[PDB]
Design an enzyme around this catalytic site. Structure first.
Site, short mmCIF file in Angstrom:
data_model
loop_
_atom_site.label_atom_id
_atom_site.label_comp_id
_atom_site.label_asym_id
_atom_site.label_seq_id
_atom_site.Cartn_x
_atom_site.Cartn_y
_atom_site.Cartn_z
N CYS A 96 1.03 -1.25 0.25
CA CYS A 96 -0.02 -0.17 0.01
C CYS A 96 0.88 1.29 0.15
O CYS A 96 1.69 1.57 0.94
CB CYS A 96 -0.99 0.04 1.16
SG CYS A 96 -2.03 1.45 1.31
N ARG B 141 -0.09 4.14 3.23
CA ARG B 141 -0.05 4.07 4.37
C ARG B 141 0.52 5.45 5.34
O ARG B 141 0.39 5.00 6.62
CB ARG B 141 0.98 3.00 4.85
CG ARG B 141 0.76 1.42 4.27
CD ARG B 141 1.67 0.54 4.77
NE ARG B 141 2.56 0.13 3.63
CZ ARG B 141 3.71 -0.15 3.87
NH1 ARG B 141 4.17 -0.82 4.92
NH2 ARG B 141 4.64 -0.27 2.87
N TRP C 190 -9.13 6.66 -0.44
CA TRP C 190 -9.32 7.42 -1.37
C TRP C 190 -8.36 6.82 -2.78
O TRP C 190 -7.47 6.42 -2.54
CB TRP C 190 -9.20 8.77 -1.47
CG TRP C 190 -8.02 9.16 -0.65
CD1 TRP C 190 -6.64 9.36 -1.13
CD2 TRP C 190 -7.71 9.52 0.78
NE1 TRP C 190 -5.81 9.68 -0.35
CE2 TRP C 190 -6.42 9.70 0.95
CE3 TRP C 190 -8.75 9.50 1.89
CZ2 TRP C 190 -6.00 10.04 2.44
CZ3 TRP C 190 -8.14 9.63 3.15
CH2 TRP C 190 -6.95 9.87 3.08
N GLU D 211 -4.46 4.63 -10.51
CA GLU D 211 -5.58 3.43 -10.63
C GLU D 211 -6.47 3.28 -11.28
O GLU D 211 -6.87 2.55 -11.93
CB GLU D 211 -5.79 3.19 -9.02
CG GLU D 211 -5.15 3.08 -7.88
CD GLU D 211 -5.38 2.84 -6.58
OE1 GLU D 211 -6.06 1.69 -6.02
OE2 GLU D 211 -5.51 3.91 -5.80
C1 HEM Z 1 -6.45 6.18 1.78
C2 HEM Z 1 -5.87 6.24 0.63
C3 HEM Z 1 -5.16 4.89 0.02
C4 HEM Z 1 -4.31 4.97 -1.28
C5 HEM Z 1 -4.22 6.29 -1.98
C6 HEM Z 1 -4.05 3.54 -1.41
C7 HEM Z 1 -3.19 3.16 -2.50
C8 HEM Z 1 -2.87 1.84 -2.81
C9 HEM Z 1 -2.45 1.40 -3.93
C10 HEM Z 1 -2.20 2.12 -5.40
C11 HEM Z 1 -2.15 0.03 -3.92
C12 HEM Z 1 -1.73 -0.88 -5.05
C13 HEM Z 1 -2.83 -1.64 -5.67
C14 HEM Z 1 -3.41 -1.36 -6.94
O1 HEM Z 1 -2.65 -0.81 -7.46
O2 HEM Z 1 -4.60 -1.88 -7.32
C15 HEM Z 1 -2.69 -0.31 -2.42
C16 HEM Z 1 -2.55 -1.63 -2.10
C17 HEM Z 1 -3.34 -1.95 -0.74
N1 HEM Z 1 -4.05 -1.21 0.07
FE1 HEM Z 1 -3.95 0.73 0.09
N2 HEM Z 1 -4.53 3.08 -0.40
C18 HEM Z 1 -5.22 3.68 0.62
C19 HEM Z 1 -5.73 3.18 1.71
C20 HEM Z 1 -5.74 2.16 2.24
C21 HEM Z 1 -6.62 1.62 3.64
C22 HEM Z 1 -7.71 2.35 4.24
C23 HEM Z 1 -6.27 0.23 3.57
C24 HEM Z 1 -6.82 -0.74 4.56
C25 HEM Z 1 -7.28 -0.47 5.74
C26 HEM Z 1 -5.43 -0.15 2.54
C27 HEM Z 1 -5.06 -1.46 2.31
C28 HEM Z 1 -4.19 -2.05 1.22
C29 HEM Z 1 -3.72 -3.25 0.93
C30 HEM Z 1 -4.12 -4.42 2.06
C31 HEM Z 1 -3.05 -3.38 -0.24
C32 HEM Z 1 -2.51 -4.40 -1.10
C33 HEM Z 1 -2.58 -5.62 -0.55
C34 HEM Z 1 -2.14 -7.05 -1.39
O3 HEM Z 1 -2.08 -6.96 -2.60
O4 HEM Z 1 -1.38 -7.81 -0.86
N3 HEM Z 1 -5.11 0.85 1.78
N4 HEM Z 1 -2.93 0.84 -2.00
C1 LIG Z 2 -8.40 0.82 0.12
C2 LIG Z 2 -7.74 1.15 -1.23
C3 LIG Z 2 -7.61 2.52 -1.50
C4 LIG Z 2 -6.96 2.80 -2.88
N1 LIG Z 2 -6.83 3.92 -3.39
N2 LIG Z 2 -6.39 1.65 -3.54
C5 LIG Z 2 -6.58 0.41 -3.14
C6 LIG Z 2 -6.05 -0.72 -3.89
O1 LIG Z 2 -6.68 -1.83 -3.22
C7 LIG Z 2 -6.31 -3.28 -3.70
C8 LIG Z 2 -6.17 -3.59 -5.09
C9 LIG Z 2 -6.02 -4.84 -5.60
C10 LIG Z 2 -6.19 -5.02 -6.99
C11 LIG Z 2 -4.86 -5.83 -7.58
N3 LIG Z 2 -5.13 -5.99 -8.86
C12 LIG Z 2 -6.31 -6.61 -9.38
C13 LIG Z 2 -5.88 -7.61 -10.12
C14 LIG Z 2 -4.43 -7.24 -9.34
C15 LIG Z 2 -5.77 -5.96 -4.47
C16 LIG Z 2 -5.70 -5.46 -3.09
F1 LIG Z 2 -5.52 -6.52 -2.32
C17 LIG Z 2 -6.05 -4.31 -2.71
F2 LIG Z 2 -5.90 -4.06 -1.31
C18 LIG Z 2 -7.12 0.12 -1.85
#
Ligand code: HEM
Ligand code: A1CN5
Ligand code: HEM
Ligand code: A1CN5
Ligand code: H4B
Ligand code: H4B
Ligand code: ZN
Lengths: 418, 414
Positions: free
Chosen positions: A116, A119, A288, A293
């Site tokens: 993430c 964070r 958000w 994304e």
């Molecule tokens: C508040 C603004 C947040 C932003 C801008 C953000 C951004 C991102 C991005 C760009 C990814 C990469 C996944 C993707 O590209 O699809 C990610 C992954 C992730 N986010 Fe955040 N996130 C936010 C909040 C949170 C919150 C509130 C949680 C949980 C309470 C969280 C948990 C996670 C987890 C668990 C993953 C990846 C887990 C995995 O694939 O193993 N995020 N986040």
């Molecule tokens: C809370 C939050 C805010 C934000 N702005 N973006 C995210 C992205 O969340 C996640 C996205 C994916 C997609 C992985 N790709 C699809 C197949 C590979 C997997 C996760 F496990 C996430 F947690 C989460």
């Protein structure tokens, strides 16, 4: 000790926190799996009902970590809590988390989310205790409040709603949607696809469950909610609660005529929160968007909306050969638009420059106040303009800390229907 | 045992069996991943060198369907003789070509390996002097450049003996531009090379102090002091950068060299260390247009290009940086293509790597890959390798990093 270096600044951080990891990364000293999506299956307990020598050691670890977190290791509260968890495990084969514990754990699962980039806000999460829930209706009520609170009329706020933990394994609470708000995906008779191709399968299950699809391109999918193991149930999210942003460009005024819009609230609903050996199979969390994304992956992946075609056509770009870089040029304009639309509608959004910069600061903070910060370079680096962001040049150590968010099977693969 | 990688865009699944054949460490542990560490993790005794030589000769004779043959066993016996008598051994010309081509093939961080088998190997193990090396390297440059129709080539100098008679190219690349820091703190030329530029100047090089001064070759033979030689300017193919739409782009005065030629690595074959082995191919566009021109530690012309593009540079979310970067990379590809100097764009390059990878899985049982390096430094997700799962392990022969020679050399003159 393990040092990481930034190659744009020569800042070196020293990592000790990694000594407190327990779960295998999937790597060995002879093979690196850093780009495998699911590199390991080293989970902390067997799949369902654990024995006492299985559950308690994890529970003892968490409580120990929590009380150590608040300067009360070995205190009366700590030592009684342990005895309290023992008897619970003895007499119920599980145990219940206190409210404070639940909040600590939710926050530290986000804190430990090595993928993430967002964070830096991990401490500011709003936890909604939904452990009293018993039906899909009640699940649907908890979720609507989540959505409403978190959307906050565009001033987005991060939240998680936590439903009853897994007991025996069949009595699972599950959000069958991958996100709370996604668009539908319609397999067309002529081979092609309308809407969001990622959600074709899920869209069909909804249809199969009785969902009457309006068969457009931006059809908000129903909630498919499953409570204490029963068959899931369709609920239609009140539209007034699903905030949507129409995509327009600050320069090309023909951009709004593409008819694109995206939803404002990203809310991951198919993941598993793990705390002291306990498993919350339904914990929808939201925050958000980073603008990439939506504009890079959601619009421009081949297996997603694939709108590069259109955008470049209207831009009058040489699409004959790749060397013209017409995908790159349209990609930037799309992402410019997506950002300018969210900011114009006062909907919280952060660009990949700010967010990556934010994440460098988070790392600094974490190495100073914690001794390390687990980060997954493959996922932190944004999918466009990688090297012009500070994270590209930042070395990252990746390792697995608990509490964490874990993947879990899509429920329809495992669910015995009624 | 098997291992599967998946492409999440195509759902193609490949089965890596080759990873077993590795025995050099990656630096990852079972509980920590170091996949984004730039550099993770005097010379070989007799006992160290026997199995390394054995493994290489065994792998060589397997490659040519001659394992267990009469020639295979005699070669093995011959290699042992030398390691006993001379505490080292000498590769055959076939073996050197095979090992050099395979070190390329085994380079997990190189997206260009679909070409690995067409490497032109120049054997320079008879070189004795820095003048000898200048000659060899000039011939390398003239051959590889081929009037803009670039060709892949490595030139391999005598291996390491006792560590005290190393051959080394002190240059990081054969053609690079100079960088000079000014009194006012600014930087003329290429800020990456400021240090090596000072080393040259100190060695007597009389610098032009312009923006694109091709640096002198600092050549070290048999562990003697390095020596300066000016690559003849007519063997340095250069491309003036201009833009197909923005007539003002040529006014930035930008040019780049056409021949990428990495010279500071160590080639390792069968336990032998070739501390000087400059190799060259052709450029992917982004290496010049994204990293050379737009890294903040480098030429930092985003600043200017955006300005002349009349972009809003106040807020980042205008993505002026992203928008200008694309245009700099369009200019780079169009310039090379116009001058008929070989160049591959990052889309075509990543496409070819996926094809290569799948072919390497079919016939070899895998293909080690460093996703962190394979993904181009711009437009990551819209290239197929972004969605390609990749296994990273260390096969030999390999290219390896080594200390910079001014960190370890001890001097002779005065
Ligand atoms: C508040 C603004 C947040 C932003 C801008 C953000 C951004 C991102 C991005 C760009 C990814 C990469 C996944 C993707 O590209 O699809 C990610 C992954 C992730 N986010 Fe955040 N996130 C936010 C909040 C949170 C919150 C509130 C949680 C949980 C309470 C969280 C948990 C996670 C987890 C668990 C993953 C990846 C887990 C995995 O694939 O193993 N995020 N986040
Ligand atoms: C809370 C939050 C805010 C934000 N702005 N973006 C995210 C992205 O969340 C996640 C996205 C994916 C997609 C992985 N790709 C699809 C197949 C590979 C997997 C996760 F496990 C996430 F947690 C989460
Ligand atoms: C023929 C066209 C070639 C292209 C387009 C190409 C492209 C690249 C690129 C883009 C990188 C990433 C490094 C960076 O961006 O800084 C790389 C790395 C590398 N390439 Fe290639 N390359 C080519 C030929 C070769 C040849 C001929 C060799 C050796 C004979 C080679 C060996 C390597 C090595 C050793 C690395 C880096 C591995 C490391 O640093 O650990 N490549 N290449
Ligand atoms: C032959 C060839 C053709 C081509 N197109 N590109 C290359 C680039 O290869 C390399 C790039 C780097 C960058 C290292 N930077 C200093 C810290 C990061 C280091 C190497 F050792 C390489 F080998 C080589
Ligand atoms: C910190 C990180 O490992 C470092 O910046 C790497 C990332 N990926 C790279 N990829 C390429 N092609 N070249 C590089 O120099 C780097 N640098
Ligand atoms: C193969 C590769 O690991 C996979 O496609 C990853 C790469 N990096 C990513 N990074 C983010 N932020 N999100 C993703 O889904 C992925 N996918
Ligand atoms: Zn690893």
């Amino acid at each position: 000790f393990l040092k990481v270096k930034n190659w744009e600044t020569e800042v070196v951080l020293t990592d000790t926190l990694h000594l407190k990891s327990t779960l295998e990364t999937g790597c060995t000293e002879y093979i690196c799996m850093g780009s495998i999506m699911h590199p390991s299956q080293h989970a902390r307990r067997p799949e369902d009902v654990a024995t006492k020598d299985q559950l308690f050691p994890l529970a003892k670890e968490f409580i120990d970590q929590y009380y150590s977190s608040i300067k009360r290791f070995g205190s009366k509260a700590h030592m009684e809590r342990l005895e309290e968890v023992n008897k619970e495990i003895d007499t119920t084969s599980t145990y219940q988390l206190k409210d404070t514990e639940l909040i600590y754990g939710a926050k530290h699962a986000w804190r430990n989310a090595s993928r993430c980039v967002g964070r830096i806000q991990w401490s500011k999460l709003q936890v909604f205790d939904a452990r009293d829930c018993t039906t899909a209706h009640g699940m649907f009520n908890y979720i609507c409040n989540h959505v409403k609170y978190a959307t906050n009329k565009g001033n987005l706020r991060s939240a998680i709603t936590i439903f009853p933990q897994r007991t025996d394994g069949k009595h699972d609470f599950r959000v069958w949607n991958s996100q709370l708000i996604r668009y539908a995906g319609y397999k067309q008779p002529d081979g092609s696809t309308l809407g969001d191709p990622a959600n074709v399968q899920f869209t069909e299950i909804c249809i199969q469950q009785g969902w009457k699809p309006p068969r457009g391109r931006f059809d908000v999918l129903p909630l498919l909610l499953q409570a204490n193991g029963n068959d899931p149930e369709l609920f239609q999210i009140p539209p007034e609660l699903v905030l949507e942003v129409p995509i327009r460009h600050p320069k090309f005024e023909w951009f709004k005529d593409l008819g694109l819009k995206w939803y404002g609230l990203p809310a991951v609903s198919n993941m598993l929160l793990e705390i002291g050996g306990l498993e919350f199979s339904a914990c929808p969390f939201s925050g958000w968007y980073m603008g990439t994304e939506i504009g890079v992956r959601d619009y421009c992946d081949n297996s997603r909306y694939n709108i590069l075609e259109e955008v470049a056509k209207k831009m009058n770009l040489d699409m004959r050969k790749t060397s013209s870089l017409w995908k790159d040029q349209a990609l930037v304009e799309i992402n410019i638009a997506v950002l300018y639309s969210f900011q114009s509608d006062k909907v919280t959004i952060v660009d990949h420059h700010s967010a990556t910069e934010s994440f460098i600061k988070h790392m600094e903070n974490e190495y100073r106040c914690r001794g390390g910060c687990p980060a997954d370079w493959v996922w932190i680096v944004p999918p466009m303009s990688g090297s012009i962001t500070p994270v590209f040049h930042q070395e990252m150590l990746n390792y697995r800390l608990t509490p964490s968010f874990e993947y879990q099977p899509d429920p329809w693969n495992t669910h015995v229907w009624k």
